[PDB]
Amino acid sequence: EKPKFLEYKTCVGDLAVVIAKALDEFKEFCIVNAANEHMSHGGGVAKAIADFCGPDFVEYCADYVKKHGPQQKLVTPSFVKGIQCVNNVVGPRHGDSNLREKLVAAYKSVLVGGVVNYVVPVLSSGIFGVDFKISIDAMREAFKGCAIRVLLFSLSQEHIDYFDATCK
Amino acid sequence: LGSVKPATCEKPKFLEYKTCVGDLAVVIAKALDEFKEFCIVNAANEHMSHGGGVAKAIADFCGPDFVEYCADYVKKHGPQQKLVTPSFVKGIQCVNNVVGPRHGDSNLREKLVAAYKSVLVGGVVNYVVPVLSSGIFGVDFKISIDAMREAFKGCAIRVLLFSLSQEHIDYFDATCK
Ligand SMILES: Nc1ncnc2c1ncn2[C@@H]1O[C@@H](COP(=O)(O)OP(=O)(O)OC[C@@H]2O[C@H](O)[C@H](O)[C@@H]2O)[C@@H](O)[C@H]1O
Numbered sequence A: 001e002k003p004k005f006l007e008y009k010t011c012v013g014d015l016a017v018v019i020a021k022a023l024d025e026f027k028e029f030c031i032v033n034a035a036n037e038h039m040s041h042g043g044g045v046a047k048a049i050a051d052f053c054g055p056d057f058v059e060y061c062a063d064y065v066k067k068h069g070p071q072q073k074l075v076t077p078s079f080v081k082g083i084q085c086v087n088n089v090v091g092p093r094h095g096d097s098n099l100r101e102k103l104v105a106a107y108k109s110v111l112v113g114g115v116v117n118y119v120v121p122v123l124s125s126g127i128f129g130v131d132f133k134i135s136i137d138a139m140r141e142a143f144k145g146c147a148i149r150v151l152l153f154s155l156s157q158e159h160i161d162y163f164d165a166t167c168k
Numbered sequence B: 001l002g003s004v005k006p007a008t009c010e011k012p013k014f015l016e017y018k019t020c021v022g023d024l025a026v027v028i029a030k031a032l033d034e035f036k037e038f039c040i041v042n043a044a045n046e047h048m049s050h051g052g053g054v055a056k057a058i059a060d061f062c063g064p065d066f067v068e069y070c071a072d073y074v075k076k077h078g079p080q081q082k083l084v085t086p087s088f089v090k091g092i093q094c095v096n097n098v099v100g101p102r103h104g105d106s107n108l109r110e111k112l113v114a115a116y117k118s119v120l121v122g123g124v125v126n127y128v129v130p131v132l133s134s135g136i137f138g139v140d141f142k143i144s145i146d147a148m149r150e151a152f153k154g155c156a157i158r159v160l161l162f163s164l165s166q167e168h169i170d171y172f173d174a175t176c177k
C-alpha cells in the first residue's frame, strides 16, 4: 500500500487539525518537524509538535543531543498512535547561505526507510523567514519520482495557494 | 554472569508478535511507544565490532559508552557468542548481542534455533528482534524466521520482529496463517 507515485494533499491550519486530517486520510504517517540543530522545540511547529507529542518526546530529543551533539536530522518516537515517528529536519535560516540547494537537501532528508506517508510543514518559512516559494519549489524538486504521499501544511493560506499554483 | 534489572511490565498471557519494516530509528520509535521497556537484540560478530548491518546502526544509536563497553569487555574476556550489555538509552533495558550462524554452516537450522533461544534475558518480557543471520551472514531469511518461531513457541513474551526488508516481514505474516 505504497502509492504508485507521488501523491500530494494540503492543509491550512494549526497542527491539531492537520494531524486529525492526516490520521483520517493516511491512517499512519511520519510527521516532519521544522527543527533547529539543538532540537530545542521552543516555537513555531516545533513547539506545537513538542506540546502534542509530550515530555517523552521533548526528553528523547534533549537526551539525544546531549549524547550525540547537534543534529541536522533526527528521527524520533512520536508517542502518539498513528504517528510512526517524528522526523526533525533542520532547514536553512535567512542569510543563509545558499537557500535552494539547502532546502532540497532538507526535504530529501525527510524520507525515512519503512515510511510512505509524510506530513510536512513549509520548512524555513516561519520563525526565520526564508521565502516560502523557494522552500516549496525545493520540496517539489526533492520529492520528484518518489512513491510517497505528502500532506503539505502551513498556517498561511498563501503558502498552499502557491503550492496549488503548480498542482493546478 | 548476573541478571538484568527486572521489567516493570508484566509478561503477557501468551506469546505476542508485532512487526516493523524500516530503519532502526523507525523500529525503536514504534517499540518505545508500544513497550514501555524492552531488550533490543543485535545481530553481532564474536568480536562485537559492529562494523556493518544492524550492528553498526545499533552501535551508532547507543553511542560511544556502548561502543566502549563492548570493546572493553571483549578486550578482557575475549570473543563472545552472546553479550548482554547496557544500552545507555532510556526504555532499553539492555542490548543482547547474539552471534548467529552463517551460510553453509553445518546443522544450520538447529544453530538458528539456539541463537533465538539465547535472546531471552531473565526479567525481560519485551524484545525487539532482527532477522538474525539474514544480512551479511548470508542465511535464507525464511529459515531464520522459522527457527525464531520454533525457539519462542510457548514463551510468555512480546516480540517485535524487524527488518529493512518488506519481504521478510511479509513472510512472517504468512507463518501466522
Ligand atoms: N540500519 C538498520 N535498521 C534496521 N534493520 C537493519 C539495519 N541494517 C540491517 N538490518 C536488518 O537486520 C538484519 C540482520 O542483518 P545484518 O545486520 O547483516 O546481520 P547478520 O546477517 O547476522 O550479519 C552479522 C553481522 O553483520 C554486521 O557486520 C555484524 O557486526 C556482524 O559482522 C536483517 O533483518 C536486516 O534487514
Ligand SMILES: Nc1ncnc2c1ncn2[C@@H]1O[C@H](COP(=O)(O)OP(=O)(O)OC[C@H]2O[C@H](O)[C@H](O)[C@@H]2O)[C@@H](O)[C@H]1O
Residues within 6 Å of the ligand: A013, A014, A015, A016, A018, A034, A035, A036, A040, A041, A042, A043, A044, A045, A046, A047, A048, A091, A121, A122, A123, A124, A125, A126, A127, A128, A129, A130, A153, A154, A155, A156, A159
Ligand atoms: N502551530 C502550528 N501548526 C501548524 N503549522 C505551523 C504551526 N506553527 C508554525 N507552523 C508552520 O510551520 C512551517 C515552518 O514554520 P516554523 O515552525 O516557524 O519553522 P522554521 O521557519 O523552519 O524555523 C525553525 C525554528 O523555529 C522553531 O523555533 C524551531 O525550534 C527552529 O528553531 C510554516 O509553514 C508555518 O506556517
